[PDB]
Design a protein around this ligand. Structure first.
Ligand SMILES: [Mg+2]
Ligand SMILES: [Mg+2]
Ligand SMILES: [Mg+2]
Ligand SMILES: [Mg+2]
Ligand SMILES: [Mg+2]
Ligand SMILES: [Mg+2]
Ligand SMILES: [Mg+2]
Ligand SMILES: [Mg+2]
Ligand SMILES: [Zn+2]
Lengths: 79, 60, 154, 54, 192, 143, 192, 128, 153
RNA sequence: GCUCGGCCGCACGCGCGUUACAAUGACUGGCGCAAAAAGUAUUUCCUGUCCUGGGAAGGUACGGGUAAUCUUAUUAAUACCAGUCGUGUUAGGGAUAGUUCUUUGGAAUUGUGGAUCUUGAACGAGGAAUUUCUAGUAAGUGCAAGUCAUCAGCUUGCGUUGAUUAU
């Protein structure tokens, strides 16, 4: 098998994914986000940063391969 | 000075090594004097392996 | 208030200083950035040309810092400070030294900005680079700006 | 007309040197400028002043 | 002031219950409350010295393994702290309470061994010491970590966190440590 | 010559040496002329902050302490700094304070860690011939 | 000064000089019991004391061997006549010198005098001179075309330890026969 | 078909090498177009002997106009680099047992003469 | 960027110089997909033609693609140093070209042919299917292994 | 003795070993962390400044050191901090090849080493077997010394980071 991880997100979905980080979970890393949204890791990171600048998400730890972030209001239940 | 040498003159199978040391001790002594006093203080018997070097800086 | 108006480079995390002074060198547009810059990798030890287009700035910034700290540090020693391991392949990794021309360019061009002088009075390493009153003032004010921005963070 | 004798350069490498004692070229010890093959050295070692403490 | 581990985790909230472990797991002591898991200790010069070593340092020790990772400690201190963060993000209680909980909760008790007596050679039902119980617990947890994290995207911090939580939860599906523990205890029960 | 109010202690791990100098005043810690903040691997800075937090800042606000460290590699260096600092305060409280305080800070520290006032005796092991190391040996073929 | 020489390279060179001398003297002096050589070095001179059992043969018939030697060192190294000085010093106790005694049995074995008798003669001499213990090893063909090794001990003997290097004096010689080289070691443990 | 070296012909090369007032066997203009190891061999020196050698070829090359092929020139200089002035000659190159006759082509100037005479035989097996 | 507005315009498969180009990938290391292009040259090609090196290959403009084919055609005319080329000065012609998809296999084939014809050691050696650089054939290379001129498939 | 080969020749069998199969990773920057060894019969040995070159490397412009004084009390590399790359024969891995450039040597072709572009193989953790090893130890990580004009995947040593498990 291979995992096709999308290398672009449509301008149709973008801030819809960004504004609702809790779809990923209680804990956001490269791996979590890669799993949930089927986005390739580099873009996963870029998303992390974007929605971190956006006050939606906060850094717990950064170690060269490891991103650890949490959601501000807490995990907010889907749909 | 260390020289590490293989024991057997041959390739005879076990590798054994010889740690061969030669230690050199270097001392310095400084004097404030005139020539004759120097030649007085150097007047005694010394064991063979000793190197003695003398240098003279004038002082005013 | 005894919170110090003044802060030495020694009081400041070096990474910050470098990115900051590089910023200053861009805003100033005070550097030449030669032509061989485009086609050349840092050291002989590297497979890929640098990922930051700004390296010349960064490398120069850091360079100044080195010269601020270690005075009389000539090019070769810097090639070693600025060098790394190099994979020779199935041969063991071994130490390797940086390129010269880039570093010497950075020092020529930093004399040009009055931030370092070539010492003619050291009779050992003659024409080794030492920071100036001026360059010192400049670096120390960058450093201070930084350090205050740091103690401003509660 | 022996003119060609020994006329190949011995300037450097293995033939430039030899053991002062036994005249071996092989495994020569050049390290303190002592020019002695390993075996010959091992023999002279106490006369040269090289102790084994270790 | 009572030091917290990494500065964010209070040791005072960890209490061990099972009377075998209280002498065998470090964190109770003034000497075992450490900001940093790195002692540079002499823990191996005598038989039981290993006991006096902080449990997290022990775990870190187990992590440092395979030829390429040997003797890189900083890496493992990072991995551990991160995994601990992910742990507090999942459970929400002291990642230590979870760890210690999961060292206690997963490791063998019964194990089988060959005891020759005259003619008898066959496996026999044997009980596991406290020290070995702990040691094994850690060995297992981390081996599961490696096997899983090997070619995956999940990092060691992640794999390890997953494992620690499952290990305390007793999950025999999600926890490798408990997979082996139960397997061993079953081999043992069958060999009596 | 005017003998200063100085105290000078040393500290050691592996090939690393720390000389800490203690004088009275508004407390600085400068290692190699720089704040602890900038010590290279960040993680073990807390190792240096340990005896500080253990004694409380109250002892340290009264004293400027400057530690120069030259030695082996990052970690041992950190341990040397630790050591020198720790027994430095102790030496100060010996000369300039009552002995009693020296004693109670000694006990205070050592109950936490002994590596502070006592040096790690361990050093490297020389290599035995016939191996890639100081014990392990060239592989052997038996059959 | 002459030339600035490496203290290391100089000293090794001095040792090599000494050894060349020792080989030279043991080789060309072979008839009178030759033990040792002691070299003092003056900017003016080089003084060599030849420590020997029979000084009389070092000198020869009114400096036949002496003058020969002195001139040999002269042509060999190059030296001024004031620059070289050779003294011969007697070894007061011949029984405490190995190289001497091995020269003795070299001699006695050349004259076809039997092994055990000769060995005994020297051993009895050595202990007569107050040496605590002595041993002699003769190796090579003795009996037949097949090599033998014969040891003769009497008195007190140490082999192992640093004391070995102190108390034990050893010398070897190669002895020549129509049949080949046979060889002889003498270990005299010295007294305290 | 043509024959070209660094954009030059045999006519052109012979025009640089027979170029007036260049008394070195291999002139600088030619040596600039060589690979680095040759340039190195030239600028570093050369031996007088090779001159005589090339001369022999000159003699053997003009002495068979009718096309029976040249009279072979035996020599031990393997370390010799081919000058274009040798193209069309046949030269014995010693392989250590034997003199290998080699006929020169336009494509072989840059390389050493040794590169042609086989020093050894290839390996053709059997045991099982 | 990640966001692309119309999913309709992204080219997964791109085609440059008789060779496919992987679209979901970073542009220069995607350009590595050509014989003659390794990573450093691709990064150069991006610096001359002012193409974003952090971008993807699907985001490629056809204009750009033709310009790249042009780079490869006359590289030295586009600037760039001579010392950066796969072919410095050809045996036949003194010119400096850089080796394309097809052109490379061509020139190598040619070289080796003139080496057979020459009857040099190493050309013969190539023909024989042996190691050229003069290393040891006693031990390694056994049960067959790739000899010179490696072709990826 | 001299000249050229040969010991390096390859269907294969057997030993030491270097490097890898990657995310505890590779790569791009940043970062005043070693120890121990060496060193000039005067320009030859360590080499520090300086200058030129994109680079390996070249100048010879100013200099020190037969050395606790000079190279240096530095110049090591794991490690750490950013950033790229995102589990796929991918930048993992680089064998093998073709041009160019440089250095040691009368001599480098049968690639002495080094540099630049290319080219990119096997290898996805290894069957039966089997080696060494208990603490600054294993393992990783570089550095020196021997060899030496040039040539370390070897040896002999040197530190750095530092274990699992027995007892
Ligand atoms: Mg790096
Ligand atoms: Mg190693
Ligand atoms: Mg130079
Ligand atoms: Mg050096
Ligand atoms: Mg070639
Ligand atoms: Mg090679
Ligand atoms: Mg050398
Ligand atoms: Mg060898
Ligand atoms: Zn010899």
């Amino acid at each position: 098998d291979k995992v096709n991880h999308a290398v672009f997100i449509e301008k149709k979905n973008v801030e819809s994914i960004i504004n609702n980080p809790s779809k990923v979970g209680k804990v956001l890393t490269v791996s979590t986000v890669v799993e949930k949204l089927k986005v390739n890791g580099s873009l996963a990171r870029q998303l992390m940063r974007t929605m971190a600048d956006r006050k939606l998400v906060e850094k717990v730890a950064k170690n060269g391969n490891q991103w650890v972030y949490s959601v501000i209001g807490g995990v907010k239940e889907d749909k | 000075l260390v020289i590490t040498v293989r024991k057997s003159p041959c390739g005879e199978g076990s590798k054994t090594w010889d740690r061969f040391e030669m230690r050199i001790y270097k001392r310095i002594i400084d004097l404030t004097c005139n020539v004759p006093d120097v030649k007085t203080i150097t007047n005694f018997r010394i064991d063979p392996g000793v190197e003695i070097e003398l240098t003279m800086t004038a002082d005013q | 208030s005894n919170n110090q108006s003044f802060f030495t480079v020694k009081d400041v995390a070096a990474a910050d200083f470098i990115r900051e002074y590089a910023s200053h060198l861009k805003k100033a547009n005070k550097l030449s950035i030669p032509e061989f810059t485009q086609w050349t990798t840092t050291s002989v030890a590297r497979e890929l040309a640098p990922q930051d287009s700004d390296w010349v700035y960064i490398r120069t910034a850091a360079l100044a810092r080195k010269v601020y700290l270690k005075p009389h540090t000539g090019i070769s020693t810097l090639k070693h400070i600025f060098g790394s391991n190099k994979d020779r392949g199935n041969l063991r990794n071994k130490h390797q030294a940086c390129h010269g021309k880039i570093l010497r360019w950075a020092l020529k061009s930093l004399e040009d900005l009055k931030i370092i002088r070539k010492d003619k009075n050291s009779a050992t390493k003659k024409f080794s680079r030492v920071i100036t009153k001026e360059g010192m003032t400049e670096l120390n004010r960058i450093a201070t700006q930084i350090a205050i921005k740091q103690r401003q963070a509660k | 007309p022996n003119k060609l004798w020994r006329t190949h350069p011995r300037n450097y490498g293995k033939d430039s040197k030899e053991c002062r004692v036994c005249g071996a070229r092989q495994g020569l010890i050049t390290k303190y400028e002592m020019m002695t093959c390993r075996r010959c050295f091992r023999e002279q070692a106490p006369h040269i002043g090289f102790v084994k403490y270790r | 002031t009572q030091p917290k581990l990494f500065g964010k985790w209070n040791y005072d909230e960890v209490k061990i219950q099972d009377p075998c472990f209280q002498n065998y797991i470090a964190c109770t002591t003034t000497k075992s409350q450490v900001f940093v898991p790195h002692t540079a200790g002499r823990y191996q010069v005598k038989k039981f010295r290993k006991t006096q070593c902080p449990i997290v340092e022990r775990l870190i020790g187990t992590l440092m393994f395979h030829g390429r990772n040997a003797g890189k400690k900083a890496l493992c201190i990072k991995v551990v702290k991160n995994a601990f963060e992910i742990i507090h993000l999942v459970t929400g209680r002291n990642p230590l309470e979870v760890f210690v909980g999961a060292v206690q909760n997963a490791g063998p008790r019964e194990d089988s061994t060959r005891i020759g007596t005259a003619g008898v050679v066959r496996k026999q039902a044997v009980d596991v010491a406290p020290m070995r119980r702990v040691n094994l617990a850690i060995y297992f947890i981390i081996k599961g970590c490696r096997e899983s994290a090997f070619k995956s995207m999940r990092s060691i911090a992640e794999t390890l966190a997953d494992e620690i939580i499952n290990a305390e939860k007793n999950n025999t599906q999600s926890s490798w440590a408990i997979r082996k523990k139960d397997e061993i205890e079953k081999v043992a029960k069958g060999n009596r | 010559q005017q003998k200063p109010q100085l105290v000078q202690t040393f500290g050691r791990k592996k090939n690393a040496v720390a000389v800490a100098s203690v004088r009275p005043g508004k407390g600085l810690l400068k290692v190699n002329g720089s704040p602890i903040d900038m010590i290279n691997p960040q993680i073990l800075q807390a190792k240096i902050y340990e005896p500080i937090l253990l004694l409380g800042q109250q002892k340290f606000a009264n004293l400027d302490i400057r530690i120069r460290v030259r030695g082996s590699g990052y970690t041992s260096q950190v341990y040397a700094i630790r050591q020198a600092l720790s027994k430095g305060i102790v030496a100060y409280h010996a000369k300039y304070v009552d002995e009693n305080s020296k004693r109670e800070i000694k006990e205070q520290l050592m109950q936490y860690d002994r590596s502070l006032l006592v040096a790690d005796p361990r050093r490297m092991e020389p290599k035995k011939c016939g191996g890639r190391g100081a014990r392990s040996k060239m592989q052997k073929a038996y059959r | 000064t002459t030339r600035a020489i490496n203290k290391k390279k100089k000293f090794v060179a001095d040792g090599v000089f000494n050894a060349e001398l020792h080989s030279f003297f043991s080789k060309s002096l072979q008839d009178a019991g030759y033990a040792g050589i002691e070299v003092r070095r003056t900017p003016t001179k080089t003084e060599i004391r030849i420590k020997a059992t029979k000084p009389q043969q070092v000198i020869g018939v009114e400096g036949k061997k002496h003058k020969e030697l002195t001139q040999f060192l002269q042509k060999r190294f190059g030296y001024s006549d004031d620059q070289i000085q050779i003294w011969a010093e007697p070894i007061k106790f011949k029984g405490l010198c190995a190289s001497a005694q091995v020269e003795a049995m070299n001699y006695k074995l050349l004259k076809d005098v039997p092994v055990r008798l000769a060995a005994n003669y020297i051993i009895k001499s050595v202990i007569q001179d107050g040496a605590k213990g002595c041993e002699i090893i003769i190796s090579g063909k003795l009996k037949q075309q097949r090599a033998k090794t014969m040891k003769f001990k009497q008195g007190y003997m140490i082999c192992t330890g640093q004391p070995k290097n102190d108390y034990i004096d050893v010398a070897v010689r190669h002895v020549f026969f129509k049949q080949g080289i046979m060889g002889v070691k003498v270990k005299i443990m010295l007294p305290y | 078909k043509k024959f070209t070296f660094r954009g030059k012909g045999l006519e052109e090369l012979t025009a640089l090498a027979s170029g007036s007032n260049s008394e070195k066997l291999i002139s600088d203009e030619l040596a600039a177009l060589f690979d680095a190891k040759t340039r190195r061999r030239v600028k570093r020196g050369i031996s007088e002997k090779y001159a005589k050698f090339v001369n022999k070829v000159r003699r053997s090359k003009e002495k068979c106009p009718a096309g029976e092929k040249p009279v072979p020139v035996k020599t031990h200089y393997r370390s010799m680099i081919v000058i274009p002035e040798l193209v069309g000659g046949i030269v014995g190159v010693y392989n250590g047992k034997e003199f290998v006759n080699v006929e020169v082509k336009f494509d072989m100037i840059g390389k050493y003469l040794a590169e042609f005479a086989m020093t050894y035989k290839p390996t053709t097996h059997g045991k099982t | 960027s990640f966001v692309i507005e119309k999913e309709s315009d992204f080219k997964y498969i791109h085609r440059i110089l008789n060779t496919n180009i992987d679209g979901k990938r970073i542009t220069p290391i995607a350009l590595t997909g050509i014989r003659g292009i390794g990573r450093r040259f691709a990064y150069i090609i991006c610096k001359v033609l002012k193409i974003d090196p952090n971008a993807r290959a699907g985001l490629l403009t056809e204009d750009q693609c033709n310009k790249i084919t042009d780079l490869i055609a006359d590289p030295e005319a586009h600037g760039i140093p001579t010392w950066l080329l796969n072919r410095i000065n050809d045996f036949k012609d003194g010119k400096n070209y850089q080796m394309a998809s097809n052109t490379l296999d061509t020139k190598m084939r040619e070289d080796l042919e003139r080496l057979k014809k020459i009857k040099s050691h190493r050309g013969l050696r190539h023909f024989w299917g042996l190691k050229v650089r003069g290393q040891h054939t006693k031990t390694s290379g056994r049960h067959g292994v790739v000899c010179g001129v490696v072709r990826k498939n």
